[PDB]
Design a protein around this ligand. Structure first.
Ligand SMILES: Nc1nc2c(ncn2[C@@H]2O[C@H](COP(=O)(O)OP(=O)(O)NP(=O)(O)O)[C@@H](O)[C@H]2O)c(=O)[nH]1
Ligand SMILES: [Mg+2]
Ligand SMILES: [Mg+2]
Ligand SMILES: [Mg+2]
Ligand SMILES: [Mg+2]
Ligand SMILES: [Mg+2]
Ligand SMILES: [Mg+2]
Ligand SMILES: [Mg+2]
Ligand SMILES: [Mg+2]
Ligand SMILES: [Mg+2]
Ligand SMILES: [Mg+2]
Ligand SMILES: [Mg+2]
Ligand SMILES: [Mg+2]
Ligand SMILES: [Mg+2]
Ligand SMILES: [Mg+2]
Ligand SMILES: [Mg+2]
Ligand SMILES: [Mg+2]
Ligand SMILES: [Mg+2]
Ligand SMILES: [Mg+2]
Ligand SMILES: [Mg+2]
Ligand SMILES: [Mg+2]
Ligand SMILES: [Mg+2]
Ligand SMILES: [Mg+2]
Ligand SMILES: [Mg+2]
Ligand SMILES: [Zn+2]
Lengths: 66, 144, 230, 117, 65
RNA sequence: CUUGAGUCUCGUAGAGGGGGGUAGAAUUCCAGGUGUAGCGGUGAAAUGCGUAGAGAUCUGGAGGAAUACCGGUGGCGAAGGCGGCCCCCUGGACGAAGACUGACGCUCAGGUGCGAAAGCGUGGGGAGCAAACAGGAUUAGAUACCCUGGUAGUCCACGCCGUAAACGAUGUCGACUUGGAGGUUGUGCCCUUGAGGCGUGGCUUCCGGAGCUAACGCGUUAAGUCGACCGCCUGGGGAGUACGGCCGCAAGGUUAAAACUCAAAUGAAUUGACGGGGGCCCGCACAAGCGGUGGAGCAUGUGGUUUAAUUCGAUGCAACGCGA
């Protein structure tokens, strides 16, 4: 979020570090996931589905070679 | 090209200046395969251009096309699912052709009774960044 | 088909259930394609105030200015039916229109059928009325001829009709066929569209032109079905 | 009219409009622009280039204040956040400090329903 | 990674502000355990300590405040 | 009698429960400061708000509700469920070692209790959200989706309701049966120890062997192999309906038919077809180009119209300088 410029620093590098900082916090994803209410049932189902997809991907990572 | 991005073929230099760009110019100006008419027109226009610009007529052609060559142009993209314009840079080989194309069409629009004269006049105004050839280049830069 | 061996249709519209310069135009196009003589009636003028009557007549005249028989009748007060009765005599007339417009009530008033037997009549609620009459029944006119009560309808869309048949259906367009410089003149923005300028100077009803265009574009939406209509 | 010589550029990058204001470091406003008041309307209004325009549209009317350096506080998800300050630097302004002040609640309030688009 | 267990710590202390501040971002957010490498019980102790510190204003809740 | 069951001693982890404080963001509102002309919203708009000064920004205030990050395939609880921090009261589980009692056990018709959300009663509270409703758009209509508002409700106290796809669609308890990779939480030994290696418990996740299953799949947390007890089923509709009983303030809940009607209804899986489902890979399909057609005159074919006859056939691509 907060990025303070130094003396004799090009403005472009300051811009790029500020944007990469703000996107390191994922603030845009935060303000977008809080735009509309999400019933906890849908939240739970999507979280669980993402998790099982992650498990299946990590399984495919190690079942091909073995 | 969906599958094979084929390479472009080579053009032969012009028998009066050995200049690949001049040959490309006459190939662009050509109409109905009448190469001889085109070469007559281009040599006449180059020589009168030389008379106004003094020495180095082939070089005068080079700087004329330079003063109107495009750097940035709008490009269409359907990735969004709707028509989307984007400003993009142009490779040198392509902007050469774009400059030549803009020159020849502008000359045809000029009229005044002779293609030789139209081409020469457009080239002469192009050499000094004028003649509306630069204005068409300027407007497509503004559209970035 | 709704009813056969018909001689005349009477487009029954009413201000309260819905006012639709679009359904009337769709009906006019249809009956023109079917060569049946139409007639426009507007029911329930009792609801409109005298100012409102002068506000509805100066666009009901749109059709009487192209010859269409346009009448205004109040079924509840039996007001101005008498010319409708005259126009109904000795012909076969199907009463058509949206649900709630008063087609059944108009028939009760005109036929003067015995009190024991009357058509179902429920009042409209909120935006649109119920569909009371779900049948098509013939009735013998007292003086002469026959009428037919029909069920109310929502969409009289015309995807079966060819696009040219819609230009023919608008009777105020024959005065300008072949006057467009582009022969295949879609007439919307094509240069030299005669009816474009015709409606620019007020020769044509703007609402009619817009309705023509919008029903054309409606046919594009309903051409999705691959079923056949021949 | 009065040269503070130092100040702050506050941005407001909504998905509909971008609001760029200038003020003293104390929050009393001097000049403010908007992509809406910039002659861009509708989908044309919510464009990054519209915010880039509003940048100068704000910078001009505070030349009398003539703040030399400035710190920018951008808040909002709307497109154009970076382009306003990119344009502002192209106007000769020097950015002392960039910072994001996007309001984030800790689960404080119920947001509106999901649009069944 | 897993420095706490590696030092066999018994309880993480909220009062320390030099040690556990290696576990928050500049925005003051508790860094997840996937990257700090700390273990579950110690991650929970860390979160509780950090919230305690926040309450007594030794650590900021956010960079803004 | 002590092996099942239970007690005691010492510790561990935990959004377990009830009550009370408190914190920091954020929304809204009020008041004030700066200051201009728009704000807001959509695919696009409009309604709406703003010159009395909106929106923006700063300061102060008020109120309600919820606790980003931690956060997890994590934990706890009989289930429903439980998420800031702290205090008070309180339930369960697990581990090591040892002592203690001595079958004290399992299941459970009736019965009792708990029990998401919505809803009901009384009384508070009400920021945001939002059935109903008001309005603007779209549309035949929009009575919907979208937009601007917005009441009950959502929160608290006390009662009532007692139902959910209350689901793992898998009753409880016990025993036995090949393996692998994890997560979490105890604990022993050995290490030079952080590490690290040997073990040994609890809960939990994903594969998979035998075996089982209609198949899908289950697979030591079985849907395997067996015991004990309970609940439930007997084709699809009619119907979880009628009547009666009980319960409820009411909404309704529970128990629960029959007449009548059909030869099906259904579960899994197979092949294809289709999708306003995805992944592609090609094609002058598009893009990039060059020249056209579409306007004019004429040539020619066709439709139509005409005619005594304008012979017949070809009619989306794939008929129309076609048979000819
Ligand atoms: N105020 C008013 N109401 C009228 C008038 N004529 C008829 N109505 C009422 O409007 C309603 C029309 O219902 P009905 O006649 O069945 O409608 P319909 O147009 O025949 N079609 P549908 O059967 O589908 O409803 C009835 O309540 C009728 O009594 C009239 O002149 N004024
Ligand atoms: Mg009727
Ligand atoms: Mg279909
Ligand atoms: Mg909204
Ligand atoms: Mg003994
Ligand atoms: Mg019982
Ligand atoms: Mg409730
Ligand atoms: Mg209540
Ligand atoms: Mg009340
Ligand atoms: Mg709403
Ligand atoms: Mg409307
Ligand atoms: Mg309480
Ligand atoms: Mg049940
Ligand atoms: Mg069940
Ligand atoms: Mg069983
Ligand atoms: Mg029991
Ligand atoms: Mg398995
Ligand atoms: Mg039966
Ligand atoms: Mg019942
Ligand atoms: Mg192309
Ligand atoms: Mg032609
Ligand atoms: Mg023929
Ligand atoms: Mg034949
Ligand atoms: Mg041919
Ligand atoms: Zn026309």
């Amino acid at each position: 979020p907060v990025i303070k410029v130094r003396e004799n620093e090009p403005f472009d590098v300051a811009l790029r570090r500020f944007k990469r900082s703000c996107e390191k916090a994922g603030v845009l994803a935060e303000v977008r996931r809080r735009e509309f209410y999400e019933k906890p049932t849908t939240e739970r189902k999507r979280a669980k589905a993402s998790a099982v997809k992650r498990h299946a991907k990590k399984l495919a990572r190690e079942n091909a070679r073995r | 090209p969906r599958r094979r991005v084929i390479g472009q073929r080579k053009i032969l230099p012009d028998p009066k200046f050995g200049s690949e760009l001049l040959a490309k110019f006459v190939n662009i100006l050509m109409v109905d395969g009448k190469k001889s008419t085109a070469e007559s027109i281009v040599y006449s226009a180059l020589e009168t251009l030389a008379q106004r610009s003094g020495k180095s007529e082939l070089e005068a052609f080079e700087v004329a096309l330079e003063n109107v060559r495009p750097t940035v142009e709008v490009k269409s993209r359907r990735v969004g699912g709707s028509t989307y314009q984007v400003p993009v840079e142009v490779r040198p080989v392509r902007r050469n052709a774009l400059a030549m194309r803009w020159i020849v069409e502008a000359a045809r629009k000029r009229g005044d009774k002779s293609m030789a004269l139209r081409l020469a006049n457009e080239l002469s105004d192009a050499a000094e960044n004028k003649g509306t050839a630069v204005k068409k280049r300027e407007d497509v830069h503004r559209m970035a | 088909p709704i009813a056969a061996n018909i001689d005349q249709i009477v487009i029954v519209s009413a201000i309260l259930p819905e006012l639709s310069l679009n359904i009337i135009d769709r009906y006019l196009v249809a009956c023109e394609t079917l060569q049946i003589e139409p007639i426009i009636v507007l029911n329930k003028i009792d609801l409109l105030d005298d100012e409102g009557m002068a506000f509805v007549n100066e666009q009901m005249d749109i059709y009487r200015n192209i010859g269409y028989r346009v009448l205004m009748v109040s079924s509840h007060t039996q007001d101005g039916l008498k010319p409708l009765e005259e126009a109904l005599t000795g012909r076969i007339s199907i009463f058509a229109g949206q649900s709630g417009v008063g087609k059944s009530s108009l028939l009760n008033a005109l036929l003067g059928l015995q009190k024991e037997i009357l058509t179902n009549d429920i009042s409209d609620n909120s935006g649109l009325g119920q569909h009371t009459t779900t049948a098509a029944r013939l009735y013998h006119f007292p003086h002469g001829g026959d009428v037919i009560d029909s069920p109310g309808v929502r969409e009289f869309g015309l995807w079966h009709l060819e696009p040219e048949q819609i230009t023919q259906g608008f009777v105020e367009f024959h005065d300008y066929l072949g006057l467009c410089k582009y022969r295949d003149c879609k007439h919307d923005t094509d240069p030299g569209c005669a009816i474009r300028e015709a409606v620019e100077e007020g020769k044509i009803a703007e609402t009619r032109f817009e309705n023509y265009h919008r029903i054309l574009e409606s046919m594009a939406q309903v051409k999705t079905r691959k079923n056949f209509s021949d | 009219r009065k040269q503070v010589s130092d100040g702050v550029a506050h941005i407001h990058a909504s998905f509909n409009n971008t609001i760029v204001t200038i003020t003293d470091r104390q929050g009393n406003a001097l000049g403010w622009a908007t992509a809406g008041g910039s002659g861009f309307r509708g989908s044309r209004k919510s464009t990054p280039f519209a915010a880039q325009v509003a940048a100068e549209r704000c910078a001009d009317a505070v030349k009398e204040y003539g703040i030399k350096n400035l710190e920018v506080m951008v808040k909002g998800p709307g497109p154009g956040r970076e382009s306003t300050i990119r344009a502002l630097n192209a106007a000769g302004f020097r950015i002392t400090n960039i910072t994001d002040v996007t309001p984030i609640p800790h689960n404080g309030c119920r947001p509106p329903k999901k649009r069944r688009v | 990674f897993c420095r706490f267990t590696a030092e066999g710590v018994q309880e993480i202390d909220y009062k320390d502000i030099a040690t556990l501040k290696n576990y928050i971002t500049e925005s003051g957010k508790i860094v997840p355990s996937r990257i700090t490498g700390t273990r579950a019980k110690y991650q929970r102790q860390l979160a509780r300590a950090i919230k305690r510190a926040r309450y007594l204003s030794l650590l900021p809740y956010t960079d803004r405040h």
